[PDB]
Amino acid sequence: VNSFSGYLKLTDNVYIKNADIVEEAKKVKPTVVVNAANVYLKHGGGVAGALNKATNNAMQVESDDYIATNGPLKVGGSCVLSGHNLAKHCLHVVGPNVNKGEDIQLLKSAYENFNQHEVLLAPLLSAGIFGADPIHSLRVCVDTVRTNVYLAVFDKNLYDKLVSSFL
Numbered sequence: 026v027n028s029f030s031g032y033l034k035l036t037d038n039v040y041i042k043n044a045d046i047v048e049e050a051k052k053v054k055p056t057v058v059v060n061a062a063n064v065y066l067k068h069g070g071g072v073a074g075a076l077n078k079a080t081n082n083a084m085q086v087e088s089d090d091y092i093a094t095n096g097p098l099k100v101g102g103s104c105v106l107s108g109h110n111l112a113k114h115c116l117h118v119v120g121p122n123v124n125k126g127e128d129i130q131l132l133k134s135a136y137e138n139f140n141q142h143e144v145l146l147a148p149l150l151s152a153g154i155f156g157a158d159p160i161h162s163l164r165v166c167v168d169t170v171r172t173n174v175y176l177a178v179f180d181k182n183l184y185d186k187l188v189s190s191f192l
């Protein structure tokens with residue numbers, strides 16, 4: 026039993042809800058929140074910009090130190106950093122950005138990072154400003170993630186479309 030509330034169950038381990046991941050993180054304080062990161066951990070917009078703003082820029086400060094030490098992430102890769110006031114940990118995961126021409130097959134590799142964590146609150150990878158089809162992102166998620174994932178979908182219209190078309 027965990028503290029997540031109001032989700033629709035898609036499968037044994039995948040759940041979905043119309044929610045702002047920032048407000049959801051602040052209420053649940055999950056062990057792991059997933060950020061829709063880029064390789065430079067520059068949290069300017071989309072989910073990343075929103076999560077970072079909610080940390081009063083502490084996420085960006087921590088991220089800049091991480092990059093200065095380690096260099097950029099790989100597309101499809103991840104790193105674990107602090108969750109600040111939102112979660113115990115933030116798993117920064119880099120899905121391919123279609124608007125940069127990155128290979129969509131890397132979306133499966135991106136979701137594989139979730140399997141290192143028993144329970145996660147997460148957005149749909151490569152959705153939104155990353156340019157991929159969110160119905161495909163949900164499908165890859167379901168077919169790749171085996172741990173318990175709670176997907177927060179900001180757009181109510183998109184949320185309803187994701188459910189009604191799910192197989």
Ligand SMILES: CC(C)[C@]1(CO)CCCN(c2ncnc3[nH]ccc23)C1
Nearest residue numbers: 046071072075148152153159178179
């Ligand atoms: C389609 C999908 C990739 C998105 C909608 O879920 C697109 C728009 C930005 N994304 C967010 N998702 C959940 N919570 C959020 N809070 C602020 C932004 C945000 C991801």
